[PDB]
Design a binder for these strands. Structure first.
Lengths: 442, 206, 98
RNA sequence: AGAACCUUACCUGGUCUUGACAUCCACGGAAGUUUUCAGAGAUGAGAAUGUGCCUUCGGGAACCGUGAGACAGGUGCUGCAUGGCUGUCGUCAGCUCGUGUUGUGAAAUGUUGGGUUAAGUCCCGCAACGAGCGCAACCCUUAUCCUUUGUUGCCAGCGGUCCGGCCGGGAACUCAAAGGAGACUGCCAGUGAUAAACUGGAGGAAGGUGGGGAUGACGUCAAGUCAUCAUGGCCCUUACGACCAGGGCUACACACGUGCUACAAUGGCGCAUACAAAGAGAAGCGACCUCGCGAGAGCAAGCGGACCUCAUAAAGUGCGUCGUAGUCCGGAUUGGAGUCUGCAACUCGACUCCAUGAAGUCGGAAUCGCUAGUAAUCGUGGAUCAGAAUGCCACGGUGAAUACGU
């Protein structure tokens, strides 16, 4: 016992070393004795120190093993438990982490078959695992399009789907590797999931034209991603934007959204109006239908369109500031993420100016990286440029990169720098032209 | 006696309740009975550990109690030994399994109940009350308190007749509800009777 | 189709308790009715405060039972698995009716 | 915040003595169930079956029963030994300290003075400068608007209507409960030490601490409570402890305190019929239907409860009659017959029916409350509680008079 000169022996009995011993003054943490004698107390006569890795192999008929904390660990794909080994109630190993899955075969079959195949968070090389992961993906973007999570069949059916053809020999990951080794030669496609994910819901109608994957803005084409996670920062339909395209994009007409959301969009916008204006429009779904049956996208700005056709319906002059956008839900606001050629989403927002007011230096150095010839020159004092470019253009990959060169005054000289706005180009070239004229007139 | 209990007027505004749970007309009474029954056991068992405060909450036929104490070592036990002994006994009293959280109270002589039960100990250890009390009151100002009231009462120092004595320095606004007050009483079971001990502590405006 | 009754003794606690339930429910299946503020019950308690005499000296106490209702109307059979795992604090009772 | 026993601490009688209740030891049996006998009651005696756990094979845990000693127990005395809790002046506005100055000193000054407020509230002055408890503020509720949501809550814009938000339906509105806003002498005019402030006016749902509640300083009364509890001292330890039964706490020549119901026509009675808020409910609330004049009883749905139940609010309003008669006023009292509760309703519950119908025709000396949703009146619910209120606590309905003034 710790800091105590007494020993726990068999059962709850306690003893001590007979004082005639030489290790009576040098107590071990683990002792064996020859004779137990009760005289004043319990005394072991001849005592000797032992190492407790000794007594498990030599008392196999006496060891009781208690397994606690049964937890499924991913890295082995197997359930661990802390084992305690005891004889006569003596805790030989207080704690040893051991494979509970290798210990018992009953429940661990169900646990592994659920985890590494139905949830399927497995680090492995299996081809059916790969294809079923991609199938569950192509279903979960379908649910992300639908905004209704009833299309996919439940995971218990997928567990049954696995369990009916996984043989009874599989109890753990090693047995499963051994089983896939002999079964992959006969039926590779059996473990790959069949296309029965959608059954009878009616959502699985989902229209491809109603839910596009790319948006065309002028000459440009921008990526779309879908996500169903209400209230999240990354929720809503998210447009993905290559960074050099920033100088050709504008926010006009962009709030029209995919056509699969516009009914509840205009319902949210019309109920963003205060109660007196809102009382004019009863019922809101009916008036949303009467609006969408006559409106066409991109012919007008959104606010103007709602104003003029709602005036056509009832004769109220709804002002511009009457519409509230904080009351409009965030997932209906089309998320903006500027991405690179390797789809790294650099900056984000739910309006285009959240990108533009933060990316001007990065867009500027993006322009400078492609402009590898020295139109941009410094220390310039006499006009020696020939024809200064109106709108500087380059090409990267599949898209042209456009900017505007202009003069820059420096109070000691004139310089040429790029600008992403024709107006800023105008005032910059104006000031540079003024300094150039002042330097050139005698 | 005419004043109101400051913690009892400040429960719904500033000082949180000691037990937080729900019951219908059936289970509420014997729930209170069990809440009583565990508390005095914990107090008499850990009276040497300087227990300040007890919180009960009851998660769906379970119990978690959190006891605020000033000294870690005694209540935890060496190498994590005693809290598991406290584990099963409160579950035995409850009839449901229980969880116990030990909450450290730093700045120990700013807690009212610890100050009260501390100054109870020296009166039963018969050191003289004036020095005991002014030592107990200047300490909060020294460690930066901004209100302290202290009282003892009744057969004070072997007196034939009872009297009350209060000290106070700083600011102790009882009538301000936004003022935060630590208050709990104590009794000294001296050889002549019961010394009553009261301590008010004032921390902040909100 | 499922009625989630929340009963608590603190409005400051039951608001986040029903907010957690509603955002988790709409997180994985949507179409949740708003948390309805339903009329609370006030238990008023008259106590004689002196040990022996002076009946007219009393104190008044009350219990406030903040009562909120959350309704979900559509079949949302996957949310229910994580719905039992939300481990809300002891301050509020939850009753689920079908 | 609820005495038929119980409660109960009283009395009388039958009874017990490590005990009715705790802990320590030892022994045996698990625990528990059924039956009968005497007793008003606490005993003694059977039959059935115990005997689950825990592998260290044994014991352990619970419980019962028996005995010894350490011990228990008391609503027993002391509130003038105490804590705690409470009343009180009084929600009165005052009660003090640190430092300084004066006075040998007790003490003063601050805190007095002018104004001013409900307020040592604020301003000015000032041998005072500051500080604390007090006041106010922030606490809750009510008085108006907005944001959120709209079930069981609501029905305006739509239809069908079984005429019933009945349904489809709708979220406006009431409402519900969260977050905000809103009232701060904020603005104006005059007075006023260019002050604090006062008076009047606008605006506004609310205007001058908006209203009500919580909130009670230093302390007084050796105030009340040893019987709520804890507690020092003292007392009994075969009784001042403990069990049980019947009676008492409810008596009755009288006196007082606080209420209820009346003395009536602003009313009684009969019918028709209109309008609420608040609260409770599972050993509970208890729909409908049937039976009874009724108390209720059966049957039995729903309701842990914005749905269902208690649950028809009554004054009222309109009809008809009464007619100033100790009366078609008033209902005490008394007899009979009953209903429910509960082992049990004689002492000593609650209620119904029939029959009777006391005093009382507005209260001496005196005395109390009430400054507006008040006073008065009219009903409702709750707590306690098996059953039990004219008492308390809470709720609405109608709804006043008067304040010259000190």
């Amino acid at each position: 016992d710790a800091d105590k000169q007494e020993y726990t022996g068999a059962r709850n009995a306690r003893f001590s070393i007979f004082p005639g011993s030489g290790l009576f003054k040098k107590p071990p943490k683990w002792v064996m004795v020859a004779e137990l004698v009760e005289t004043s107390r319990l005394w072991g006569r001849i005592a000797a120190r032992i190492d407790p890795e000794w007594v498990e192999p030599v008392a196999q008929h006496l060891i009781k093993r208690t397994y606690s904390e049964p937890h499924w660990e991913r890295a082995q794909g197997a359930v661990m438990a802390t084992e305690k080994v005891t004889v006569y109630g003596l805790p030989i190993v207080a704690a040893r982490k051991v494979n509970y899955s290798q210990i018992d075969p009953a429940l661990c079959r169900e646990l592994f078959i659920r985890h590494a195949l139905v949830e399927g968070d497995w680090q492995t090389r299996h081809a059916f695992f790969r294809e079923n992961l991609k199938l569950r993906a192509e279903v979960e973007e379908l649910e992300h399009k639908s905004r209704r999570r009833d299309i996919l069949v439940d995971d218990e059916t997928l567990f049954e789907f696995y369990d009916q053809r996984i043989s009874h020999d599989v109890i753990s990951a090693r047995h499963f590797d051994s089983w896939w080794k002999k079964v992959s030669r006969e039926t590779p496609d059996l473990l790959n999931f069949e296309k029965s994910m959608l059954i009878k819901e009616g959502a699985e109608k989902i229209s491809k034209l109603d839910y596009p994957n790319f948006w065309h803005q002028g000459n440009l084409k921008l990526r779309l991603s879908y996500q169903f996670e209400p209230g999240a920062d990354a929720d809503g339909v998210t447009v993905h934007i290559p960074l050099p395209l920033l100088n050709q994009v504008e926010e006009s007409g962009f709030e029209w959204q995919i056509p699969g959301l516009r009914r509840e969009l205009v319902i949210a916008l019309i109920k963003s109006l205060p109660k007196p204006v809102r009382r004019n429009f009863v019922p809101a779904p009916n008036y949303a239908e009467a609006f969408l049956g006559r409106v066409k996208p991109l012919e007008l700005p959104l606010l103007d369109s709602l104003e003029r056709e709602l005036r056509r319906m009832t004769g109220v002059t709804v002002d511009r500031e009457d519409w509230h956008w904080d009351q409009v839900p965030d997932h209906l606001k089309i998320t903006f993420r500027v991405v690179d050629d390797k789809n790294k989403k650099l900056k984000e927002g739910r309006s285009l100016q959240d990108l533009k007011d933060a990316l001007k230096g990065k867009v500027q150095e993006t322009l400078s990286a492609v402009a590898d010839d020295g139109i941009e020159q410094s220390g310039l004092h006499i006009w020696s440029f020939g024809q200064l470019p109106e709108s500087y253009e380059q090409k990267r990959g599949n898209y042209k990169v456009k900017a505007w060169p202009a003069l820059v005054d420096e109070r000691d000289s004139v310089a040429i720098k790029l600008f992403d706005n024709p107006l800023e180009q105008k005032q910059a070239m104006w000031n540079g032209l003024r300094r150039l004229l002042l330097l050139n007139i005698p | 006696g005419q004043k109101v209990h400051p913690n009892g007027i400040r429960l719904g505004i500033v000082k949180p309740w000691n037990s937080t749970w729900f019951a219908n007309t059936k289970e509420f009474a014997d729930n209170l009975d069990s809440d009583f029954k565990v508390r005095q056991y914990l107090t008499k068992e850990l009276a040497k550990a300087s227990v300040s405060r007890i919180v009960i909450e009851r998660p769906a036929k379970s119990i978690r109690v959190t006891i605020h104490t000033a000294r870690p070592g005694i209540v935890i036990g060496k190498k994590g030994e005693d809290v598991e002994k406290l584990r099963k006994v409160v579950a035995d009293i409850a009839g449901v399994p229980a969880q116990i959280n030990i909450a450290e109270v730093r700045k120990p002589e700013l807690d009212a109940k610890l100050v009260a039960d501390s100054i109870t100990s020296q009166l039963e250890r018969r050191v003289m009350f004036r020095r005991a009390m002014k030592r107990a009151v200047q300490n909060a100002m020294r460690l930066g308190a901004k209100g302290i009231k202290v009282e003892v009462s009744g057969r004070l120092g072997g007196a034939e007749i009872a009297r009350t004595e209060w000290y106070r320095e700083g600011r102790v606004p009882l009538h301000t509800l936004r003022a935060d007050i630590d208050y709990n009483t104590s009794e000294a079971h001296t050889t002549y009777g019961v010394i009553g001990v009261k301590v008010w502590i004032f921390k902040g405006e909100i | 189709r499922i009625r989630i009754r929340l009963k608590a003794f603190d409005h400051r606690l039951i608001d986040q308790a029903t907010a957690e339930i509603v955002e988790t429910a709409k997180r994985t299946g949507a179409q949740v009715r708003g948390p309805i503020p339903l009329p609370t019950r006030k238990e008023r308690f008259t106590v004689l405060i002196s040990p022996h005499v002076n009946k007219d000296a009393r104190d008044q106490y009350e219990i406030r039972t903040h009562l909120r209702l959350v309704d979900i109307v559509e079949p949302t059979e996957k949310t229910v698995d994580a719905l039992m795992r939300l481990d809300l604090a002891a301050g509020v009772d939850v009753q689920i009716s079908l």
